[PDB]
């Protein structure tokens, strides 16, 4: 997985050499920024159920056909509502992992790789997940650097869906 720390190590390994002073200061910078990032991840984690619940309802309100139109890809059944809440929770979980890891790597590996193919094969509209992500941004209540970082990962997910 790519993180600021694994990137420093990979650079040294590529050149067959021990780590440089610049590489160590890069990791020091990561350590100093990690404090605020992990606090953001814990705040999102503590509020995850409310954010997931609210985001799902926001999608259903924006796109009412998703709760009536027939088909297993829609949320017209309890099983479909459960799939949708599950997926929204996955996206929020990935945001928290990016905050912990210091970059997009977790979302890249566990969600974005293959995303277009999954949404196509299973007939899932990217617009649904974009609306869920906008709701999360509007309601997570983060401020300062925590908001910059969380919204960076949310906007990155929106870009991947766009």
């Amino acid at each position: 997985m790519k993180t600021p720390i694994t990137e420093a190590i990979a650079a040294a390994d590529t050149q067959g050499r021990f780590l440089s002073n610049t590489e160590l200061q890069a990791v020091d910078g990561r350590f100093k920024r990690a404090v605020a990032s992990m606090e953001a991840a814990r705040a999102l984690t503590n509020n995850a159920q409310s954010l997931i619940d609210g985001a799902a309802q926001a999608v259903y309100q924006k796109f009412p056909y998703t709760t009536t139109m027939q088909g297993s890809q829609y949320a017209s059944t309890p099983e479909g509502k459960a799939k949708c809440a599950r997926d929204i929770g996955y996206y929020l979980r990935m945001v928290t992992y990016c905050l912990v890891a210091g970059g997009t790597g977790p979302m890249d590996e566990y969600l974005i790789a293959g995303l277009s193919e999954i949404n196509s094969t299973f007939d899932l509209s990217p617009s649904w997940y974009i609306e869920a992500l906008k709701y999360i941004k509007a309601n997570h209540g983060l401020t300062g650097q925590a908001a910059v970082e969380a919204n960076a990962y949310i906007d990155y997910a929106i870009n991947a869906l766009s």
Binding site: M1, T3, I5, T6, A8, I9, A10, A12, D13, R17, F18, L19, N21, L24, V27, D28, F31, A34, V35, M38, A41, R42, T45, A48, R93, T96, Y97, V100, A101, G102, G105, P106, Y110
Partner: protein, 172 residues
């Protein structure tokens, strides 16, 4: 490779779980103590050539069979390969210390190494001893109380010893 943060994330994802308070607390403590980790990597790296050469001298004093004609470190080509391997292993250990996770050492150094030595006829147990001698010297250097703000780095030194021991166990 994983660092300590990516490792917790990977463990959480396989369970479909947000991080627990214990995981958050463990990572916050790692960061709180990060200056000590940086000193350890800096100190070991800056003394890497001495750590290797002294450990090699100590190995051959203890195991002269390696440098008798016919021994696995006899000839300058074999001796140089042996010194190179010691430096390689030390290098990947320093990466593991920086990352706070052994994956880089496992994936890019130790995996397949026992089998490589078995096919060459290199005594893996002697490589393990060489690693142990580098371990002791690296910890004494990383944990030197002079020229550094006083504080307790015993937890880090145990972690460092763990990576060296993991390398030794993978070749013994």
């Amino acid at each position: 490779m994983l660092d300590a943060f990516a490792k917790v994330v990977a463990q959480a994802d396989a369970r479909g779980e947000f991080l627990t308070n214990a995981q958050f607390d463990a990572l916050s403590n790692l960061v709180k103590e990060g200056n000590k980790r940086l000193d350890a990597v800096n100190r070991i790296t800056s003394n890497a050539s001495t750590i290797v050469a002294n450990a090699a001298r100590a190995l051959f004093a203890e195991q002269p069979q390696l440098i008798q004609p016919g021994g696995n470190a006899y000839t300058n080509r074999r001796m140089a390969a042996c010194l190179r391997d010691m430096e390689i292993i030390l290098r990947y250990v320093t990466y593991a210390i920086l990352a706070g996770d052994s994956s880089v050492l496992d994936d890019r150094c130790l995996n397949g190494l026992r089998e490589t030595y078995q096919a060459l006829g290199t005594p893996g147990s002697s490589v393990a001893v060489a690693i142990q001698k580098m371990k002791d010297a690296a910890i004494a250097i990383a944990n030197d109380p002079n020229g550094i703000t006083p504080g307790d780095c015993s937890a880090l030194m145990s972690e460092i010893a763990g990576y060296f021991d993991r390398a030794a166990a993978a070749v013994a």
